[PDB]
């Protein structure tokens, strides 16, 4: 079957066939759409088909489908599964798998870059100290003094589910949040729970508004251990505005390296529960969400106050006015300091070009409109006007529950 | 089978049971989500009638009464005998209000129970349709104090005698393809304008020409009528701080009035059912004014503001966008024409969702349409999980009549 998508601005029509290769479920049915729902130990049994499907895809990508090398690898993996109940990826397959999980990530607007991903193989890691070292190297490499490079570090896969490698942090670099006795929050409200765990584990909290959290690292199913990222490795940008000189006095800064550390990478049925990956920021992630969500730094009021906007009625669009200024400031600050960032116009335009190319060479590009459309100025970006088809391909990145909810404490 | 929706800003969780009533299909499957796709006999009719009358009698706390049974019997007899049936006035009003209630793409539904229903099932000619429509326009406009209304023409019969309004909205501006190569007026309406010209209309060839109505009675060839200019409330657009803004020569009309949709009630089909509310500011200032395939004025406005249009990263488009939208709201407010901003409307909608969850067990909502086209995440609907599903009575898309009509 063929499925068409239309862009209602350009009338360009694309034809999707790639969706036929999708097997995993969406959450939706013929009677309900779950498109806005954020979230709608394998046996041999289930494992060889998953491995075979992956290796067929890999060997096709290298133009060696059906070759002796392809057949020998299938046999070798099969014997390894029946004998050890799992298998190890070759380095090449690991690299291919990790790039494809990114290529397949339907919520990711930054996918034009998918084939340029530096893969760091950390499958020989055994301890939390080993993990800390790998992560520091990743941070240093990715940061590259402001000229950001995409990277992923891949720790040992799940075995019995009792020996999992996990990074307890949701991102490698994030600011602490502290709930005060009066009910207010100091720092980032998103990270209160994790910050409380760190303190419990023995972290001495500076208790300021932008304290970089320690890493809390779990190797081999052991209790997690605390480590401080060397401050010299943590690149940060003070936020100022090109025309408003009072903007600096808001005391705002942000870190340069967006690095997700709590997702699960699935390749050929294997589960990599610790796979921190990083890119660079689109400006709205910081200027819209991190700064202006009510449940985050929530700076809209203070900024609009300083701008002397009419705050007496929502219909003055004071919030919208302050919003644009904050986002100008984020982009200006990053650019002035020579730290990679992309604006939402540039990034959505690139994604549309990526998507059309993918339709041509690959037969499709799964995309989740709810996430791809930026959180400000939606319809003045080309993605708003683009019909998208959302479906799940493997290799993939998946959500996993926070480890404090599941961990069996050794003590 | 029982489903939860979470608000990620407030942690409030609602439980949806109403989706289990859902009849029609979404376009989605377990394998593929189509959430962002714009458009994915006697024997058939009695089930649909029954389902509807059951919900109606339920709503007036008379479920399983003799009056309920008797009506089911009567409609059953009527379908058996005539191949269709006629709604009671009470049922018509109920169905129309519920079609709005069920409109998953409508952020303005807190208002759903205050809908004025004009029963035009006694209409027979295009001139009668023109009359009904003028009365709707005047009633709804109410000198700027807008009131929601729907006018319901006769239901489909054998489908060769359809009433249709060919216009997509009762009030829209003409679009003219130019020798130049550009477009004058609204490019969205170039084709409909040509059809009007072809059917005889004398176009003034301006930027903001109110289109004539093209009305189809009883499956006949449609006819042209000019809405009395005096019934079309328009608003010149100025800015509370930028004096040059008025020089752009922009205006918009007060009454958003959809006229090309099909109302389905208890299996009966009302192919001409124009309905109207009032505007949310972004519809005009973001979509009508700034879409590239619409009036596309961002460039001109940005220039008048003297912004750095060199780099996308100066966010000049974004800055101009906010100002255009401040001006739209300010202009409607100053002229006392009802308008709602996107903060107000979305806040109202969250309250409505809570009401519907509490009283009805849910509210079908299409997040893709509900979240405004600017400043998404600073409105509360962005952070609200929504389940989308189809309930009847409903408003449905139907194809433009010219691709169908046999002249
Ligand atoms: C290279 C620069 C990149 C940019 C500008 C970018 C942009 C984004 C943005 C804006 C989002 C939505 C983020 C949010 O709203 O929370 C996102 C989501 C995501 N991207 Fe990227 N991306 C980049 C690189 C990467 C890389 C290297 C990977 C993995 C190898 C990746 C995989 C993902 C995934 C899995 C999500 C979904 C996250 C979730 O569900 O919470 N992206 N991307
Ligand atoms: C009273 C003020 C109202 C407001 C502020 C309002 C708001 C909106 C908005 C902003 C949209 C999206 C329009 C677009 O993006 O093109 C919409 C869609 C819609 N509304 Fe309303 N609404 C109102 C009244 C009504 C009424 C009176 C009805 C029917 C009786 C209705 C039924 C619909 C339908 C069916 C759609 C979807 C149209 C489509 O699919 O193209 N609404 N509403
Ligand atoms: C790699 C990368 C680059 C870039 N520019 N930006 C990002 C941001 O991704 C951050 C990730 C972490 C939050 O996760 C929230 C979340 C919650 C839940 C319940 C599920 C889910 N998939 N995601 C939102 N997206 C990642
Ligand atoms: C009643 C009402 C109130 C209000 N404030 N705003 C409106 C605007 O609705 C206008 C209607 C006409 C366009 O039609 C778009 C469209 C196209 C297609 C192909 C399908 C579809 N369902 N809708 C967009 N929605 C309507
Ligand atoms: C309920 C809703 O799905 C939720 O707020 C989503 C909407 N779209 C998003 N889009 C992006 N990029 N990131 C997000 O966190 C969200 N949140
Ligand atoms: C392709 C995509 O579905 C399309 O551009 C939608 C997105 N959301 C929308 N939302 C509203 N309210 N109105 C629209 O016309 C659209 N267009
Ligand atoms: Zn769906």
Curated annotation (Swiss-Prot), chain A:
Isoform N-NOS-1 is expressed in brain and colorectum. Found in the Auerbach's plexus of the enteric nervous system. Isoform PNNOS is expressed in the penis, urethra, prostate, and skeletal muscle, and coexists with the cerebellar nnos in the pelvic plexus, bladder and liver, and is detectable in the cerebellum. Ubiquitinated; mediated by STUB1/CHIP in the presence of Hsp70 and Hsp40 (in vitro). It comes from the Eukaryota. L-arginine binds at residues 171, 280-281, 285. It is found in: Cell membrane, Sarcolemma; Cell projection, Dendritic spine. (6R)-L-erythro-5,6,7,8-tetrahydrobiopterin binds at residues 36, 370-371, 384. Signal peptide: none annotated. Keywords: Calmodulin-binding, Cell membrane, Cell projection, FAD, Flavoprotein, FMN, Heme, Iron, Membrane, Metal-binding, NADP, Oxidoreductase, Phosphoprotein, Synapse, Ubl conjugation. GO terms for biological process: arginine catabolic process; behavioral response to cocaine; calcium ion transport; cellular response to epinephrine stimulus; cellular response to growth factor stimulus; cellular response to mechanical stimulus; establishment of localization in cell; establishment of protein localization. GO terms for molecular function: ATPase binding; cadmium ion binding; calcium-dependent protein binding; calmodulin binding; enzyme binding; flavin adenine dinucleotide binding; FMN binding; heme binding. Its main location: membrane. Heme b binds at residues 108, 399. Coiled coil: none annotated. Homodimer. Interacts with DLG4 (via N-terminal tandem pair of PDZ domains); the interaction possibly being prevented by the association between NOS1 and CAPON. Forms a ternary complex with CAPON and RASD1. Forms a ternary complex with CAPON and SYN1. Interacts with ZDHHC23. Interacts with NOSIP; which may impair its synaptic location. Interacts with HTR4. Interacts with SLC6A4. Interacts with VAC14. Belongs to the NOS family. The PDZ domain participates in protein-protein interaction, and is responsible for targeting nNos to synaptic membranes. Mediates interaction with VAC14. Produces nitric oxide (NO) which is a messenger molecule with diverse functions throughout the body. In the brain and peripheral nervous system, NO displays many properties of a neurotransmitter. Inhibitory transmitter for non-adrenergic and non-cholinergic nerves in the colorectum. Probably has nitrosylase activity and mediates cysteine S-nitrosylation of cytoplasmic target proteins such SRR. Inhibitory transmitter for non-adrenergic and non-cholinergic nerves in the colorectum. This is Nitric oxide synthase 1. It comes from Rattus norvegicus (Rat).
Curated annotation (Swiss-Prot), chain B:
Produces nitric oxide (NO) which is a messenger molecule with diverse functions throughout the body. In the brain and peripheral nervous system, NO displays many properties of a neurotransmitter. Inhibitory transmitter for non-adrenergic and non-cholinergic nerves in the colorectum. Probably has nitrosylase activity and mediates cysteine S-nitrosylation of cytoplasmic target proteins such SRR. Inhibitory transmitter for non-adrenergic and non-cholinergic nerves in the colorectum. Homodimer. Interacts with DLG4 (via N-terminal tandem pair of PDZ domains); the interaction possibly being prevented by the association between NOS1 and CAPON. Forms a ternary complex with CAPON and RASD1. Forms a ternary complex with CAPON and SYN1. Interacts with ZDHHC23. Interacts with NOSIP; which may impair its synaptic location. Interacts with HTR4. Interacts with SLC6A4. Interacts with VAC14. This is Nitric oxide synthase 1. The PDZ domain participates in protein-protein interaction, and is responsible for targeting nNos to synaptic membranes. Mediates interaction with VAC14. It is found in: Cell membrane, Sarcolemma; Cell projection, Dendritic spine. Isoform N-NOS-1 is expressed in brain and colorectum. Found in the Auerbach's plexus of the enteric nervous system. Isoform PNNOS is expressed in the penis, urethra, prostate, and skeletal muscle, and coexists with the cerebellar nnos in the pelvic plexus, bladder and liver, and is detectable in the cerebellum. The chain holds residues 299 to 716 of 1429 of the full protein. L-arginine binds at residues 169, 278-279, 283. Signal peptide: none annotated.
């Amino acid at each position: 079957r063929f499925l068409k998508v239309k862009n209602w601005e350009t009338d360009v029509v694309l034809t999707d066939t790639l969706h036929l290769k999708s097997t995993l479920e969406t959450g939706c049915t013929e009677h309900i759409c779950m498109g806005s729902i954020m979230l709608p130990v394998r046996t041999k049994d289930q494992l060889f088909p998953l491995a075979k499907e992956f290796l067929d895809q890999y060997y096709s990508s290298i133009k060696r489908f059906g070759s002796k090398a392809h057949m020998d690898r299938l046999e070798e993996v099969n014997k390894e599964i029946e004998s050890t109940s799992t298998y190890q990826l070759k380095d090449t397959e690991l690299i291919y798998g990790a790039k494809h999980a990114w290529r397949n990530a339907s919520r990711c607007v930054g996918r034009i870059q998918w084939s340029k991903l530096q893969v760091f193989d950390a499958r020989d890691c055994t301890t939390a100290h080993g993990m800390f070292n790998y992560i520091c190297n990743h941070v240093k490499y990715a940061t590259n003094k402001g000229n950001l490079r995409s990277a992923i570090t891949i720790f040992p896969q799940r075995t019995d589910g009792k020996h999992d490698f996990r990074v307890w942090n949701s991102q490698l670099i994030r600011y602490a949040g502290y709930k005060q006795p009066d009910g207010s929050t100091l720092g980032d409200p998103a990270n209160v729970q994790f910050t409380e765990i760190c303190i419990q584990q023995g972290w001495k909290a500076p208790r300021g508004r932008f304290d970089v959290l320690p890493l809390l690292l779990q190797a081999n199913g052991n209790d997690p251990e605390l480590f401080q990222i060397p401050p010299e490795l943590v690149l940060e940008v003070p936020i100022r505005h090109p025309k408003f000189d009072w903007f600096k006095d808001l005391g705002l800064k942000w870190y340069g390296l967006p690095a997700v550390s709590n997702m699960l990478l699935e390749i050929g049925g294997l589960e990599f529960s610790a796979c921190p990956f990083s890119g660079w920021y689109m400006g709205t992630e910081i200027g819209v969400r991190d700064y202006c969500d009510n449940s985050r730094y929530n700076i809209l009021e203070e900024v609009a106050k300083k701008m002397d906007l009419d705050m007496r009625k929502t219909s003055s669009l004071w919030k919208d006015q302050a919003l644009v200024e904050i986002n100008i400031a984020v982009l200006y600050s990053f650019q002035s300091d020579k730290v990679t960032i992309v604006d939402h116009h540039s990034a959505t335009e690139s994604f549309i070009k990526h998507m059309e190319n993918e339709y041509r060479c690959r037969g499709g590009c799964p995309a989740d409109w709810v996430w791809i459309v930026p959180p400000m100025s939606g319809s003045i970006t080309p993605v708003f006007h683009q019909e998208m088809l959302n479906y799940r391909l493997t290799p993939s990145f998946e959500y996993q529950p926070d480890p404090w909810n599941t961990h069996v404490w050794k003590g």
